[PDB]
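Complex record, three chains
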Amino acid sequence: AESWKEIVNLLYELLASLIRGNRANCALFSTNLDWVVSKLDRLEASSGILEVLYCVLIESPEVLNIIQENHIKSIISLLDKHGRNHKVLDVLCSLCVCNGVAVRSNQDLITENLLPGRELLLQTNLINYVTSIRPNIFVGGKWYFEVMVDEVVPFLTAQATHLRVGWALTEGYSPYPGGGEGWGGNGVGDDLYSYGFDGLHLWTGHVARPVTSPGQHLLAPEDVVSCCLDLSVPSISFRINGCPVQGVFEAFNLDGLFFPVVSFSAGVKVRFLLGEFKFLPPPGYAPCHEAVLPRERLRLEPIKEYRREGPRGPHLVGPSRCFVPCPVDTVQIVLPPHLERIREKLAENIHELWALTRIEQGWTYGPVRDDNKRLHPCLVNFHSLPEPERNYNLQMSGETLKTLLALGCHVGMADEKAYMMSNGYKPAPLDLSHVRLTPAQTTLVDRLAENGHNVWARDRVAQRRNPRLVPYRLLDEATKRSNRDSLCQAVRTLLGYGYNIEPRVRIFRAEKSYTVQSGRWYFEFEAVTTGEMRVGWARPELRPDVELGADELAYVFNGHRGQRWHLGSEPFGRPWQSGDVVGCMIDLTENTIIFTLNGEVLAFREIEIGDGFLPVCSLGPGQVGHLNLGQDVSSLRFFAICGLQEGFEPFAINMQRPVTTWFSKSLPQFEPVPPEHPHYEVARMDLAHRTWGSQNSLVEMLFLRLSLPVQFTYYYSVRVFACVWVGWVTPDYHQHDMNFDLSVTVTMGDEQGNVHSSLKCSNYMVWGSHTDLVIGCLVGLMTFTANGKESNTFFQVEPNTKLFPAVFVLPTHQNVIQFEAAMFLSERKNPAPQCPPRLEVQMLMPVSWSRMPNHFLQVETRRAGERLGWAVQCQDPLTMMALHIPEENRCMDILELSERLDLQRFHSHTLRLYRAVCALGNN
Amino acid sequence: YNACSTLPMLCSYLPRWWERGPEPALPAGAPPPCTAVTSDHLNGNILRIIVNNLGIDEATWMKRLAVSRARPELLHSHFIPTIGKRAGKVVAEEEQLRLEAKAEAEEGELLVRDECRDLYALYPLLIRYVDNNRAHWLPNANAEELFMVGEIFIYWSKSHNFKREENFVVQNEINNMSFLMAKAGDAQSGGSDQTKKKRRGDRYSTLKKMLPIGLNMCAPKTRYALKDVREFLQNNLHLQGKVEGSPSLRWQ
Amino acid sequence: ARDPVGGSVEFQFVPVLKLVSTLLVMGIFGDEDVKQILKMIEPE
């Protein structure tokens, strides 16, 4: 019987083969329409049945006349059973139209069964480009900031103008304008919190909870909208020009630093009265303009940024990187008394050295520590006046060398211990006069100065709002040029003492269209940062999800160190100074490749033609780059050399258009598991269920995301038999590793806090040699069933939303997981109930993975800025031309389908479909 | 000289520079030990001394205007490689023109080979030692800016290379290698295509395309001009020999 | 120039000239614009 499914399918194919070339067969099958439809419901070898039906339709109008208003619905239902199969659509367009004439009715039934149903066929629309703005500083006390609304142009273009405003954090919100999420950018993340438009209220998951404003209005060039956030507790509450928007957000993870955000669209401007305050309501707050503590000056940023607006063109850019309250030991390990005497010697030497510095200002010893002039106890021998009037040295400098045993150093004995006529007290220190420190020991001095400043910082909360409160990890290297280098002067006596001192990555790619397998081709990579910038030709098929380097398909050259990589390093070259453009040349027909530093010839000689190579950038997480291809004007230092000569022409000579490209996106959108994953086996089978297993020894975690959202009775089930976080998933989600649980509530207040109830939940769920089963009921609110037995359910949300059922398993190597009052495997499909279980082609298994290449977008934003006011502005909106997968909604420009073309095929058949649906003039 | 790696002490080196104005070559061979010490001087002001060193190259060039101790001079050309200026390149163009007149004289020795050329073969090895110093001359960024006379000077360097295509003597030159380049020159051949009108050739894919028609001339350099800017057909005549040199590249 | 303007240049043309053609058929155009086409193609 294992040969039997092949056999049956083979028979359909036979029959089909009898049908494709004749009318009469179909004529005989006109009675079999009900039969054929009876058989299409089968879910194992349906394709042959499909070809059958297809051909039958091709060759039998009468059968089109005959088919019942429900067998057709059985076919649409088939399509829903099978997910995205283009063939079925060819079947449909075949249904639509006869030899020339058409049955308009069945077609209109197709539409009512499709077009209202929305969800089965893919569907599309468009937005306008969205652009978030942030102040430069991330927050990790209470804070407060002001956002005046200078301008709004609500209805320009078809879209209502975007201008959401709210808090956010760097992992669950990475706004790439080119689509993602159901039709937008701000307000979409579980990690982001937001505000705007009519009735004020908020957006999380891009859910429009409509908490009514005290009164009211939208966003127009008037309101001084303003925000605050209490430390620890996320009690965000927006305020409309001095009027708070009731009770709002509560209880959220503080996973990474919070920062303010202002998204916008269209021709809009907004001003920050910060450095100029207006409205500062009490919540324990401190103002944000005062938040300019580290090296960076306060400023607006557009967040993430994968295309900075550079001179000669948009630079490729990002992510750079990003944690402070914690004193970390300066007086831990004991100082042995043989060295402690030389601790007090070098301290008295540097205290007398303290006397050889401040006296240059005219200060003099004697006696009260007056703030005026010429009066300190410190200008003398350190022993003379206890340990508070000489806290500048041995009270603390002796403790500072206790830190030298505590901050990660193992010191030993090695050498013999060791004119202004200034007012007050006059010793000139020696041997501090010939100092020669080992250079890493100054970094060790940075650990010492920081670790010590940290303890003061811990009482700094009891204070004006000092810029010093932050650790030297983030400060000017000027105050650090003082407090750290002054600690080195105590260490300068140690040279006279002579004592010993022993001690997300990014990627980019060209259009597959442009994969030339022939012709001569130079290409640019204009430089910016000189780090791990690495770039080179690569065949399209390689995962951008894989990091570049060790891959067969991607010959490349580094932006630093200068060895070239392929299948790991293959050294031959040298690095470059920043702003030194890195060009490269490729023979075609001939296999050779030659990287050049601005025309400096040296690469991947002797290889093979294949898919057709494309240029590929790959930034490190801190690094920043740039690229331009084609334009004969792009022949500076580099193409002007061998490029003009050898005939190696750049891409855009061929075309009017700028090259299309794809940035990698650290967000792991789910994808269906390919056969040959490094390995995650899966097996569909009849009590219907499926089996699993890691098989090969292999690394962490399985975010097992089943594709299908729950609609708004039915149990759903997943046994496990080998610590694992069961809890049904939220569709928009993402992040990687551990996650127990690093994922949410909202008061529906009336300002009073009495609240019209308060809700928000499951934005998923988490859990911790008895097997593990899960039979959770639904339809409504969530009802968990941990370990088969009931154990309550903290979750409850039914605003008519669709959402995932899934689990984040950690593998037990062999046989990772099992999988499966009335069974769910039916209601998920349109033909609810039909109670018996029916596993099937669309029973998807798309695990979330990682990095994927979304499109660069040729044009998007035209923002302009300002300071001593920060009146940021931008001009004309342009559309996010787009479609979306109706399930797990996510806007995507249609052109994105050009390269994951299977969906292009599906779409194209949708269009054929409609085209058949017109019935030649049906209105 | 490897050991190289008081303002008045530098004045003694100015007097050592004066010793060079006088320049018998055996006494001068030991100066290459002194010239290598000048590399330590390069660590700026010493670039003016390197301009003086450019006149030193023009002095060794006078030898080139007309045996194994010349190999020791090629070891001094090795000291040149540590030194590896554009008006001195015009003097190098006079050195290459001296090499042109002399390599064309080596070609006259090859006419004797028709019925002997063995004494030319020692010159062929000595001409190879000249070519060592051309690697030091290869700087080529300045030639990119020329794309004219620098290229026409390289055209003079190029005409000589046609005689390398002409045979058994070159095997004796291989024996010099047994006892022991030109594609970078081809940069200059492309200067014939010209500035922004060279970009227009890519629209055609401007003179390089007519030069590509000239590759067919060499399949058969008076004949390149016969088809007909006759100076551009003379640039095709450089290409005519270069394509028959490309037939020599079939050996490679 | 091989831009391609869409679907390898030529495939881009089809649908548009189709639109033009039919739209021309329906009585929209010219006047003018069809004259623009005829000047576009002869030229004369």
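Note: Residues 10-25 of chain C form the longest helix (16 residues).
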